[PDB]
Amino acid sequence: RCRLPGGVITTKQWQAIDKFAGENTIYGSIRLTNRQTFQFHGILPVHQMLHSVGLDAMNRNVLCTSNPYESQLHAEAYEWAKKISEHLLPKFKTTVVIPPQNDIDLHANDMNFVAIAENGKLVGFNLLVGGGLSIEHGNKKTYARTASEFGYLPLEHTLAVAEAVVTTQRDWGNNAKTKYTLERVGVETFKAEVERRAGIKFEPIRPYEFTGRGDRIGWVKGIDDNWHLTLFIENGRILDYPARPLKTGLLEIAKIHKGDFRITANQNLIIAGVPESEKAKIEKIAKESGLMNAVTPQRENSMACVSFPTCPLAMAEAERFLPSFIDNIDNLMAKHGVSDEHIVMRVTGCPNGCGRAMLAEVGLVGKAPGRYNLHLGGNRIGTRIPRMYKENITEPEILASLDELIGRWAKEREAGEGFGDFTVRAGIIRPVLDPARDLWD
Ligand code: SRM
Ligand code: SF4
Ligand SMILES: O=S([O-])[O-]
Numbered sequence: 457r458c459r460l461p462g463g464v465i466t467t468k469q470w471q472a473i474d475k476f477a478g479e480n481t482i483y484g485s486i487r488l489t490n491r492q493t494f495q496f497h498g499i500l501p502v503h504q505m506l507h508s509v510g511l512d513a514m515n516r517n518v519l520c521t522s523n524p525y526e527s528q529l530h531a532e533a534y535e536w537a538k539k540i541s542e543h544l545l546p547k548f549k550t551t552v553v554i555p556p557q558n559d560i561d562l563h564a565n566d567m568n569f570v571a572i573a574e575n576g577k578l579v580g581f582n583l584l585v586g587g588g589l590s591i592e593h594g595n596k597k598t599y600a601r602t603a604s605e606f607g608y609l610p611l612e613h614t615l616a617v618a619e620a621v622v623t624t625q626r627d628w629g630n631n632a633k634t635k636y637t638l639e640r641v642g643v644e645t646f647k648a649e650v651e652r653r654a655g656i657k658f659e660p661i662r663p664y665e666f667t668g669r670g671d672r673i674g675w676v677k678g679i680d681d682n683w684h685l686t687l688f689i690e691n692g693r694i695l696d697y698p699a700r701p702l703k704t705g706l707l708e709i710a711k712i713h714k715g716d717f718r719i720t721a722n723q724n725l726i727i728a729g730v731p732e733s734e735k736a737k738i739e740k741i742a743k744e745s746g747l748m749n750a751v752t753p754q755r756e757n758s759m760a761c762v763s764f765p766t767c768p769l770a771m772a773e774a775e776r777f778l779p780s781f782i783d784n785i786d787n788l789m790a791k792h793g794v795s796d797e798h799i800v801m802r803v804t805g806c807p808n809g810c811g812r813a814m815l816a817e818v819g820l821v822g823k824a825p826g827r828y829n830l831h832l833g834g835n836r837i838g839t840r841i842p843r844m845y846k847e848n849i850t851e852p853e854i855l856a857s858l859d860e861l862i863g864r865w866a867k868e869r870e871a872g873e874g875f876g877d878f879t880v881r882a883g884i885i886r887p888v889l890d891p892a893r894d895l896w897d
């Protein structure tokens with residue numbers, strides 16, 4: 457795995473990793489991860505390779521919103537993600553987030569800097585701390601937890617705050633994850649120590665709201681005459697398939713593209729900063745390579761972790777299960793006349809929770825081969841943990857349940873109402889209000 461703050465990778469870097477994947481690995485693939493970086497699988501030299509193109513391999517990749525609606529905020533947000541990443545160089549997870557997009561899934565992370573603007577210019581961050589999704593099956597002492605608001609800081613305090621949070625967690629950690637430390641000592645206690653160490657006092661939270669977590673598939677207009685093309689890549693798995701030479705297509709795009717690529721937190725890839733006059737050339741390659749094959753809104757909003765064959769911790773298939781599972785889900789959405797809708801639906805291969813099922817509207821958490829715990833009642837924006845609905849069930853049982861529930865949603869939903877919110881309103885599942893205490897029935 458590569459260090460790659462904000463998912464930004466140059467085309468020269470892309471060509472190098474393309475070569476290495478094809479020649480020096482068992483699997484031959486580039487796998488985009490949901491933390492805005494890439495992995496090789498079955499390495500057969502490697503760090504030498506990364507170093508040769510300026511890449512290096514406690515803290516994890518720092519995420520940054522990939523394709524903000526206010527395009528002019530990206531540059532400075534990314535600069536700060538990079539600065540934080542470099543500052544924390546010698547598990548802890550950090551993001552920089554640009555409202556109203558929560559593509560980076562802030563509630564899965566120990567530390568989150570929510571960008572605040574004054575005049576289309578970044579002025580500071582709200583700090584949210586203590587998210588983390590891992591659980592141990594049946595262990596009510598473990599839980600997924602969302603992140604808690606600490607307050608606002610001007611830009612000048614960013615690095616000192618980042619360091620204060622990371623060291624406070626390292627030091628106070630047992631169950632050692634920030635979420636557990638926060639619950640044990642109290643949010644106010646942790647916050648006061650961060651203030652002490654960073655030499656600051658947090659200001660009141662400044663207003664922010666999120667509206668979604670998805671990528672912006674297709675072309676969007678960026679700043680100036682630039683355009684960004686987001687390509688949906690199923691499971692982020694880049695390999696040439698029959699009729700769909702994804703890996704070759706991306707290499708060809710890398711050869712002619714004038715800007716960089718951006719790996720998204722949804723395991724997709726953005727061809728970023730394309731001049732308008734170059735759109736047709738780029739699109740032609742993408743289309744002909746299968747990179748722009750249309751999928752349903754549902755598939756665009758579904759995700760799985762790697763799981764088998766490479767993950768030594770896997771309990772059930774995730775990545776390999778997802779394409780056919782979503783074929784079946786697409787069939788259910790079509791059955792019920794909601795093919796244009798989506799349900800944030802995620803499959804994680806074990807309870808460690810990499811697939812971020814514990815922030816989904818519908819989450820499947822692997823328990824054993826072919827068996828998953830089915831969780832319901834997250835929301836579209838990812839601010840609520842979904843309670844377990846059915847335990848240790850197979851795909852046919854999951855589909856039978858979802859057929860019934862999606863059917864009810866289609867008939868009974870209010871205008872614009874998400875499936876997760878609906879399951880809560882309709883009393884199908886009880887919401888989780890305070891995970892450390894009420895996640896587990
Ligand atoms: C690739 C990825 C999933 C994906 O399909 O995209 C992944 C894959 C693995 N994760 Fe993860 N995690 C990935 C995001 C996550 C996230 C989601 C996120 O961060 O946005 C979580 C849940 C959030 C959280 O941290 O609470 C996550 C929580 C874990 C945990 C649980 C840690 C804990 O708090 O208890 C483990 C297990 C461990 O560390 O012991 C883990 C362990 C693993 C390992 C390294 C298995 C291992 O320890 O040997 C996985 C390697 C599988 C493989 O063969 O590639 N991974 N993992 C993600 C790579 C991110 C990256 O580039 O750094
Ligand atoms: S969730 Fe479990 S199975 Fe999936 S990648 Fe993470 S550790 Fe492996
Ligand atoms: O990649 S996971 O282990 O954070």
Ligand code: NA
Pocket residue numbers: 688689690691692722723724
């Ligand atoms: Na994807």
